[PDB]
Amino acid sequence: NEVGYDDIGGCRKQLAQIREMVELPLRHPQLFKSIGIKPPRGVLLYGPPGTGKTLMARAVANETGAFFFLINGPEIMSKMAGESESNLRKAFEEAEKNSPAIIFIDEIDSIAPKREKTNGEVERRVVSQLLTLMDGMKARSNVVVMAATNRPNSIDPALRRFGRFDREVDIGIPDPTGRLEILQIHTKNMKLADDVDLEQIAAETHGYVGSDLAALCSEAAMQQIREKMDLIDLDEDTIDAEVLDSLGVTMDNFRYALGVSNPSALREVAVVEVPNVRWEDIGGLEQVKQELKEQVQYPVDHPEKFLKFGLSPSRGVLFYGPPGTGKTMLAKAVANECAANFISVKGPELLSMWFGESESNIRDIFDKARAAAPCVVFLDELDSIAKARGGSIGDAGGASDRVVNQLLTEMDGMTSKKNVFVIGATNRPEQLDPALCRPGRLDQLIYVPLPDEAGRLSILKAQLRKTPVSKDVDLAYIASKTHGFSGADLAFITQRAVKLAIKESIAAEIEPVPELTKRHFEEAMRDARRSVSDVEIRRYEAFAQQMKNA
Amino acid sequence: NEVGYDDIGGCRKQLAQIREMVELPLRHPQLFKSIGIKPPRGVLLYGPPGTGKTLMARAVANETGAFFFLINGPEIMSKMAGESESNLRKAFEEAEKNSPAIIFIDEIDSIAPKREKTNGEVERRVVSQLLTLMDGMKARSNVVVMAATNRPNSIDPALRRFGRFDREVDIGIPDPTGRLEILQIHTKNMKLADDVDLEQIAAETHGYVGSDLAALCSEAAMQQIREKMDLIDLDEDTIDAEVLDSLGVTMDNFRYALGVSNPSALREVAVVEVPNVRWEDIGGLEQVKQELKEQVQYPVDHPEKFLKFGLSPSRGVLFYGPPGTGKTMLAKAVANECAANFISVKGPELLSMWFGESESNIRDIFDKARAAAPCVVFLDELDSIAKARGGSIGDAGGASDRVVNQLLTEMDGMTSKKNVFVIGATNRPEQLDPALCRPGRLDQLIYVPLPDEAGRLSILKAQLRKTPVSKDVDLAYIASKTHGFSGADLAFITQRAVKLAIKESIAAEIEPVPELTKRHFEEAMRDARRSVSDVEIRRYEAFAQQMKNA
Ligand SMILES: Nc1ncnc2c1ncn2[C@@H]1O[C@H](COP(=O)(O)OP(=O)(O)OP(O)(O)=S)[C@@H](O)[C@H]1O
Ligand SMILES: Nc1ncnc2c1ncn2[C@@H]1O[C@H](COP(=O)(O)OP(=O)(O)OP(O)(O)=S)[C@@H](O)[C@H]1O
Ligand SMILES: Nc1ncnc2c1ncn2[C@@H]1O[C@H](COP(=O)(O)OP(=O)(O)OP(O)(O)=S)[C@@H](O)[C@H]1O
Ligand SMILES: Nc1ncnc2c1ncn2[C@@H]1O[C@H](COP(=O)(O)OP(=O)(O)OP(O)(O)=S)[C@@H](O)[C@H]1O
Ligand SMILES: [Mg+2]
Ligand SMILES: [Mg+2]
Ligand SMILES: [Mg+2]
Ligand SMILES: [Mg+2]
Secondary structure (H helix, E strand, C coil): CCCCCCCCCCCHHHHHHHHHHHHHHHHCCHHHHHHCCCCCCEEEEECCCCCCHHHHHHHHHCCCCCEEEEEEHHHHHHCCCCHHHHHHHHHHHHHHHCCCEEEEEECHHHHCCCCCCCCCHHHHHHHHHHHHHHHCCCCCCCEEEEEEECCCCCCCCCCCCCCCCCEEEECCCCCHHHHHHHHHHHHCCCCECCCCCHHHHHHHCCCCCHHHHHHHHHHHHHHHHHCCHHHCCCCCCCCCCHHHHCCCECHHHHHHHCCCCCCCCCCCCCCCCCCCCCCCCCCCCHHHHHHHHHHHHHHHHCCHHHHHHCCCCCCEEEEECCCCCCHHHHHHHHHHHCCCEEEEECHHHHHHHHHCCCCHHHHHHHHHHHHCCCEEEEECCHHHHHHHHCCCCCCCCCCCCHHHHHHHHHHHCCCCCCCCEEEEECCCHHHCCCCCCCCCCCCEEEECCCCCHHHHHHHHHHHHHHCCCCCCCCHHHHHHHCCCCCHHHHHHHHHHHHHHHHHHHHHHHHCCCCCCCHHHHHHHHHCCCCCCCHHHHHHHHHHHHCCCCC | CCCCCCCCCCCHHHHHHHHHHHHHHHHCCHHHHHHCCCCCCEEEEECCCCCCHHHHHHHHHCCCCCEEEEEEHHHHHHCCCCHHHHHHHHHHHHHHHCCCEEEEEECHHHHCCCCCCCCCHHHHHHHHHHHHHHHCCCCCCCEEEEEEECCCCCCCCCCCCCCCCCEEEECCCCCHHHHHHHHHHHHCCCCECCCCCHHHHHHHCCCCCHHHHHHHHHHHHHHHHHCCHHHCCCCCCCCCCHHHHCCCECHHHHHHHCCCCCCCCCCCCCCCCCCCCCCCCCCCCHHHHHHHHHHHHHHHHCCHHHHHHCCCCCCEEEEECCCCCCHHHHHHHHHHHCCCEEEEECHHHHHHHHHCCCCHHHHHHHHHHHHCCCEEEEECCHHHHHHHHCCCCCCCCCCCCHHHHHHHHHHHCCCCCCCCEEEEECCCHHHCCCCCCCCCCCCEEEECCCCCHHHHHHHHHHHHHHCCCCCCCCHHHHHHHCCCCCHHHHHHHHHHHHHHHHHHHHHHHHCCCCCCCHHHHHHHHHCCCCCCCHHHHHHHHHHHHCCCCC
16 A cells, blocks of 8 residues: 555656656655755656556655655545635645655645636635645745646646646556566556466557556456356355365456446547558658658658758648548658657547547647647548538638637647647548648648558558468469459458458358368459549549649 | 335335445444445435435335434425424434434435536525435435435535535336336236236337326326216216126237326436337348447457456447447447347437536436446437538538537546447538547448448338238348338338338228238339439448548
């Protein structure tokens, strides 16, 4: 119940920050005294809910030799009027007494909402009590104030101003590497069986917080007990120890526990996440591959030539082309190359968060990408922004609405020195306003054509990298016959053909064929159907000839 | 008044959960101690109102040897300021005193609304009192907190976060099997007559909660007394016992009680319910029957071939075709085959719940289907979503509105590993945006043609399975003459012909004839009228030739 550094894992970069911010001024205040700067007393934690934010507090606090004081958000708000503000005054006097001191406040937004958006003056006093007492502190006190929340936007920003809270520290969703470590934290207390592959689990878990993983560990434990319920009689007052020794959680319990309701995660926000697709997994289009190698990889790798040449680059890249051409995966593979952070934002994600009005988060998309620089910001489904008013034809309203007017501010509100990059992608590029296509905003426009038969060969090579295909498969004879078919169409054929294979596989199981026959294919090849009209392409090829007329 | 397990019935799977969650840590805390996990102290009950949620609390609580404490929602809110929060502190100290303890809180939303949507700070204190005192508990306390509500969305979600309430337990509407059991619970105390067939009643009751059934039992009792009111004089101070012995409730009292006012149920929500129609009840269209056997039955039966083949399936199926082609029943019969759970959602059900703004429920549609996985989510009347803005022509607004932008998020917010399935059905498929028809969202598109005369034969065989038809009935001669007539038209003819039969049946009464004559038919056959123009079909057949051009 007392937390060390080993009890938390995965968010190493974040803990590297806090040790510089909290561990460093306390065990060595002389360093800031020798260099002659002020120690930051404004450490702020934030992130998604249930992400160890309370856990990382004591992970730092118990690893000091400093005094610690604890404040809960609702504990002060539970108290009566006046007495609640007394405890804050009782808090800081003890911390300024025991001068090496740590003040952590969990759920800071409950005692500090926006003063504009609040009703009770008792809430307004305790905010005003907090704003007063933060400034009443001293640098000679050597007392560090920590605060955590899950809603960094609901806070009164006067705290987030200078002198009170300056150190915005986000706790992001961990990678499969770091969440593997988190599983090892919870399972090292657990009693498992030898079949348990956490690395298989951590690969199969993608958007989970540690609370989801701890519930995941707690869930598969229960199913292990459910298997033993036949051997366990509940009318007994104590079960025997032999079933306790056999109580070892199987890998299949986690396979059970991956398909249950725990696995509903918290992924419905504006997330930053490193991608997984690469250049080999996208067949063909090597010209625009190198164009991204030109336009976005050269700044993130070498800003030195720019200051050599005195020229800031174009930060605005627009993808366009026919639909179903893998334009979503393109920005993921290039962020996976130069290891930049990645933020996927779709069209209705703007709108559905604006039926709930999350537009500071839209600014925070740029801010977190500024916080996670180098980062690329990917705007999927830009036609949906036009389809917020139906289209450019639409309900007579064009692409421009409150979304565009927000984005044009935030795209122009980006420093050109920043390597934070914005990637736009649509399939209906005529149906977007040129105000967003304005130079400085989005001036690079990249057409994504259909592949040729060599590209369609390279896709079918790349798509079937994980499939047990047959040996007689002439993909080139497929690539000969597939001409007008998109890369989405080719994957759609394989989804048909695998379904045709399962119409042989479990059909034989009810009557292992791990091979995808020509008979599986020539049925789907006869059933093959083109999804893109060539007269639609003649539009895009005229745009590929010239869209700069606009 | 003291409730055992036998006093509740029907929701066996839910009680199987709670015994794992409440009975299991209390009579054997050693199991979680031996396996080394934390016992969940966050049991939350929810469901429709009047569904035994208060009843199942004591059904668990009286079946422990544990201490129990009771909290009512409005009882705390009835109290004065400060004193109300005192009783919560007085609650948990007694439970942490008597350490095997059960804390049930009925109507948790009354003491815990959303802190964003509330006015009194006294409400905000008692929420803050609750959030504090939940975290003040210990695992060594071995104290379980139960809470029930009928509005799971009105709660402050900080309770529903980790450490406070993790175990979301829904109490669904029971099947006719389980509600049969509920009738036997109430009637075993009652004095009935021998004509009483609860199984006939439980078949005839479809969307009732146990409160509706208990009112149903109480209603037919009163009509039984109404029959005895001639033998009962109210000026008497005590009626004789002979009418008490004859006071036995008839089956016809329930036949009276089924048509009364009670039978208004609570069915106006997003419900999950297993269907009843099967493949035999839908004549013809065996091709798209097998297509559903391919596309949706293979994943729900065998995910093993997918991980064999490394390919996630297409989770998005769109039904389309001309109107009145039985497309509503298609998703019901396939959920009845592979025993998956079923959620019927119509078009205006989205809209009418969004004039009252129930969109978390729209997310909870996917969440409850995730809770009731395997489940299929059926979206009836997708043209109505377009008709929210009139159509795609409409009021110049297309299909896209706040509904689509919500659904595109929630459809994309589904894990591909989940067997939770989404089934779309419209009759105006041109009038829907391709953004919803996007691959990953809804890529399987299934045309539903009119049947042939053999299909029209199979329908008239299937529709007349429960009708006392005549013996001279040449359905093929009907099927010869019925050519352009839909399956809805054929049922419409029978509704005419039965009305023509009742224009012979009770006409002969006014002057058993349980046969549907050719004379009943050839009148309706002469009165037969086609509902679908063939030029409308030539649209759909061109879509059936090619809609992939979009
Ligand atoms: N990354 C993680 N590593 C280990 N345990 C974790 C992690 N994330 C969450 N947990 C566990 O889940 C709990 C989440 O509790 P809290 O940190 O209080 O939640 P939070 O992160 O503070 O956000 P709140 O409390 O909902 S505002 C932790 O106390 C741990 O028990
Ligand atoms: N050339 C291609 N190579 C590999 N995969 C492709 C290719 N074209 C399409 N796909 C796949 O088909 C889907 C289309 O990806 P997206 O880029 O999202 O489609 P889009 O071109 O953006 O247009 P929409 O409206 O989103 S379908 C993805 O699952 C891709 O993996
Ligand atoms: N499934 C059921 N089985 C047996 N009796 C039931 C069932 N559902 C409701 N009842 C009866 O109806 C009463 C309604 O009380 P509860 O349903 O427990 O209250 P609730 O479920 O919390 O819903 P509220 O009070 O309207 S929010 C119960 O006390 C039972 O007598
Ligand atoms: N092939 C069929 N087999 C059996 N019943 C059918 C058939 N076609 C239509 N019906 C009946 O016709 C009615 C129409 O059902 P629905 O699915 O609602 O019709 P639809 O095709 O979905 O178009 P609408 O707009 O709902 S009328 C139902 O009562 C069906 O039982
Ligand atoms: Mg917290
Ligand atoms: Mg796309
Ligand atoms: Mg109740
Ligand atoms: Mg219908």
